[PDB]
Amino acid sequence: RNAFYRKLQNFLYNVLERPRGWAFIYHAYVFLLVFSCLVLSVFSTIKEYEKSSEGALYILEIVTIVVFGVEYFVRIWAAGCCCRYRGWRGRLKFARKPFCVIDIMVLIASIAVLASALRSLRFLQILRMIRMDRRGGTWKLLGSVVYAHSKELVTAWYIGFLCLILASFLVYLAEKGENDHFDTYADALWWGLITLTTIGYGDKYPQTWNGRLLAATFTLIGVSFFALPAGILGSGFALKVQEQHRQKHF
Amino acid sequence: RNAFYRKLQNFLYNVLERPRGWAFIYHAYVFLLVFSCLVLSVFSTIKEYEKSSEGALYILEIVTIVVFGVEYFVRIWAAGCCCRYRGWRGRLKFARKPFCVIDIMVLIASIAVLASALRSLRFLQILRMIRMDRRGGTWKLLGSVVYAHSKELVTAWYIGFLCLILASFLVYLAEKGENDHFDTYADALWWGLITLTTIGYGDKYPQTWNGRLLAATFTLIGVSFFALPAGILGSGFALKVQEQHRQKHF
Amino acid sequence: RNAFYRKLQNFLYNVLERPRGWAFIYHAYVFLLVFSCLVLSVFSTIKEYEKSSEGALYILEIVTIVVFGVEYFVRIWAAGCCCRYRGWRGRLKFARKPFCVIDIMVLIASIAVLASALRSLRFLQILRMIRMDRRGGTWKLLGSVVYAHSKELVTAWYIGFLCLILASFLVYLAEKGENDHFDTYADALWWGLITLTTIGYGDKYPQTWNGRLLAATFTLIGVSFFALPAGILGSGFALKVQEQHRQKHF
Amino acid sequence: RNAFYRKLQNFLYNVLERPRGWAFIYHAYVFLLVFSCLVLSVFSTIKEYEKSSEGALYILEIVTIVVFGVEYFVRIWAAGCCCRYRGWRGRLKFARKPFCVIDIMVLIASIAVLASALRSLRFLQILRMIRMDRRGGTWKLLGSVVYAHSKELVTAWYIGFLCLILASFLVYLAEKGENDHFDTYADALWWGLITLTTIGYGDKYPQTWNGRLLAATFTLIGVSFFALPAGILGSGFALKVQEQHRQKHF
Numbered sequence A, B, C, D: 001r002n003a004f005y006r007k008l009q010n011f012l013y014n015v016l017e018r019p020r021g022w023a024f025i026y027h028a029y030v031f032l033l034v035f036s037c038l039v040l041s042v043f044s045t046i047k048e049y050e051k052s053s054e055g056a057l058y059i060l061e062i063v064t065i066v067v068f069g070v071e072y073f074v075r076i077w078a079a080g081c082c083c084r085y086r087g088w089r090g091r092l093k094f095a096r097k098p099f100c101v102i103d104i105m106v107l108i109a110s111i112a113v114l115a116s117a118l119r120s121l122r123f124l125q126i127l128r129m130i131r132m133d134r135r136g137g138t139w140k141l142l143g144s145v146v147y148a149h150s151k152e153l154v155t156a157w158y159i160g161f162l163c164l165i166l167a168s169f170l171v172y173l174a175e176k177g178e179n180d181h182f183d184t185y186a187d188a189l190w191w192g193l194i195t196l197t198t199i200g201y202g203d204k205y206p207q208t209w210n211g212r213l214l215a216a217t218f219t220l221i222g223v224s225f226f227a228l229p230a231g232i233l234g235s236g237f238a239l240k241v242q243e244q245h246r247q248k249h250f
């Protein structure tokens, strides 16, 4: 009973908090809730499919406030499951943390939402997605790998930037008179930035033997430069996972 | 004779089943059969080259039913080559497997095809390609590598998703009045999704100093994010092959 | 004298053949010769800059025949520098090799060129570039790495192909009536092939809530698939160089 | 006092020179200075936002000359902090170095700037960015990794070049009569170069069953080739960082 009380409350604290194998499905269903809320709002903006989504958004929005408020109250009530928190001093200081402050704030503000309307709704819908990473796991991992590869990321971005400036200047001089697309150094930088990242919208391209002959050399070099950090961080991630797996192997 | 009987039937079971060096050419020729069937159907849809491909499709389609039905009957008759199957109980339970059920089903349904016409033909032509992976080798390998890299794939897709939402919102506010392309948050999400994946169709691009100045920062960051998992899985594959080769080295 | 004779002839054989540090500059200058020949022909096709390049192409073309014929005669005369070739039997059998046959053939045919005109010139200009890899070093290395990664390349291309077929079919059904771009399954395959490779010409894009909602899921998945083998072979190359460097370290 | 003199002057030499943890913020603020100068010039070219940036560019330009001249004088005065330089002979020979020559030259020339106007300003603004890498760290690291991967970079670029030539020739023959886009071998090379790098502006695409059927094979092969070196250098960087970290681990 009361023994089941303590064991239950602890279990609740662990599912709501760090889950290992089974509570993750629960979190996945809450995430699918907020996700469909986001997609339905995106649908609800365009006035051709407006009336066919408002009512659904009302019901699902309230269901979001329901489940999040219930989660939060359990986040507080089930705080004394670890050694630290208990009574009112440990719980009080716990809510003083940054996450629980910002959480309770946004919860009340959401009630104000159901109380700059659609725009602020877009804002809150963005914010609820950040809730899905409580412990800051993704951010912490990304920052780790980026830091260890600081010098190589910087050489990739620095030399890529030099190549963008030089290529855009040269193609500017080559086609300024002949081509309408290039008229300012602003447009030559736009083309160069949207060509070395391999997007290539297609609205500005060299149209001169001088322009095409210059872009032909600088694409082969620059495109690789601007695609380096995707590869450096990719192989950084993969190597780190291999090392961690080895240490599991001991 | 009968000794050659057992040795033959076993050999048939191994070529039709897991081949090592020589039967793989046989499978490659059956695959080229179904492949040219698929390409010829793709040609046969456009009514300018219609009559010049129907007869070929008829002959080649029947040849497909011929060779697949013959393969399947040998798949059953040559099942008793391993220790398990023999007589009628091991063979019976073997056909109870999922693959042989779905195979025999689709074989009879194909006979019904030669008995929603062209559309269902497109459907079956898709399905026969899935037949080319009997043991589920490709799927099994891909699932292995993805699982071991679960945390890094999720951080790549999660942070990329945050960058897509924020960049699309900001560029929306920046160019909503000035640019026709952006009119709803649906179009800002479309541009953002088709720009950070570096496709860049070119139908929606920022056309404002505010828009271009915002997209210029967010491409440099986001494009890398959306191109991470290609690199993480790439180096995951390559590392796994190096480890397996080492263990061959012992 | 004659001692200098043998030492010279051997040296010639080594520079014309496998060079290590100093003859490579010589080969680089011959390559720049043929390269500028190729670029000048590309210029010479367009009839606005026709007369300003014909004479240069004549002089440089003959200089190419000069240096290549001289190289080839030394390739034969200096064959007896290793242990095998000497006199007339070793030299005779050496010219029987495939490379020297095709080389002498193309040399005489080039003289026939100076004796389907511009088109065949395009053909020969392509061929002379293949001459730049005598020992087949690049091809041999590429084939090595591809073979060791056979299984992962095949899973990347196979699953990417499945994703292309399924995505193109679905977007076809979604926008066939609404969008002009998609009219046949041939055009849906064209869009799908030119979208998952992240080229994105921009001439065919989904223009329907159903189309865009289907393409939005399948790009995130497929684009990674079609960009896998670039990454798998990239990390295969890099790993192989690290191993070879280690064995230099012993 | 004088002891504080020597300790100070040495400290100045180390912050202006190789900084470790704290002076790097100082350098970051000087870099943000020159960066905003570059962006403001890019704004100042377009005559719609001309008058709203000239005065800012004047003030910030002079501030650049102020801080750089002050840095340089301290670069000389604080040269005797290491063992070598002192008095007038070590300092004299130090300024004889290439960097300090080019630095003092560009400093005086900048004063001449405040004394081909806007174009030369674009030129100097480019040059000041190269100042941000004094020790040539980025260039040295990039050259290291490229050299160790010389053979694989060359096979990637060589075989990619062969694929570009062959694909452009074939698609030329396939669509020369039917498609306006392709009219010369120059345009077929332009399309091929701007398609295998996955830019895809969209101004030249095959529009013929023969053209599309040829491009469909060659994209799958070539696109990977032209995206190899980004991946090879990516995994080269990542591997080198793992080795260096291990040797820190000893």
Ligand SMILES: O=C(Nc1ccc(Cl)nc1)c1ccc(F)cc1
Pocket (backbone or CB within 6 Å): A064, A065, A068, A069, A099, A102, A103, A104, A106, A107, A110, A127, A128, A130, A131
């Ligand atoms: O938790 C919430 N937002 C949040 C924001 C930032 C961070 Cl860092 N963590 C969490 C939240 C809960 C219920 C609700 F209706 C709305 C928002």
Ligand SMILES: O=C(Nc1ccc(Cl)nc1)c1ccc(F)cc1
Pocket (backbone or CB within 6 Å): B064, B065, B068, B069, B099, B102, B103, B104, B106, B107, B110, B127, B128, B130, B131
């Ligand atoms: O085997 C066949 N389809 C299949 C489908 C799914 C799975 Cl998982 N395995 C196999 C098949 C054989 C002959 C034929 F005419 C048509 C289809």
Ligand SMILES: O=C(Nc1ccc(Cl)nc1)c1ccc(F)cc1
Pocket (backbone or CB within 6 Å): C064, C065, C068, C069, C099, C102, C103, C104, C106, C107, C110, C127, C128, C130, C131
């Ligand atoms: O060597 C030549 N072509 C070649 C072709 C294929 C292979 Cl595999 N190796 C070499 C060559 C030499 C002189 C010349 F004028 C024209 C061609």
Ligand SMILES: O=C(Nc1ccc(Cl)nc1)c1ccc(F)cc1
Pocket (backbone or CB within 6 Å): D064, D065, D068, D069, D099, D102, D103, D104, D106, D107, D110, D127, D128, D130, D131
């Ligand atoms: O140092 C400067 N330029 C430079 C150029 C090339 C190299 Cl390699 N190193 C440095 C510099 C200092 C003050 C100034 F107002 C303008 C330029």
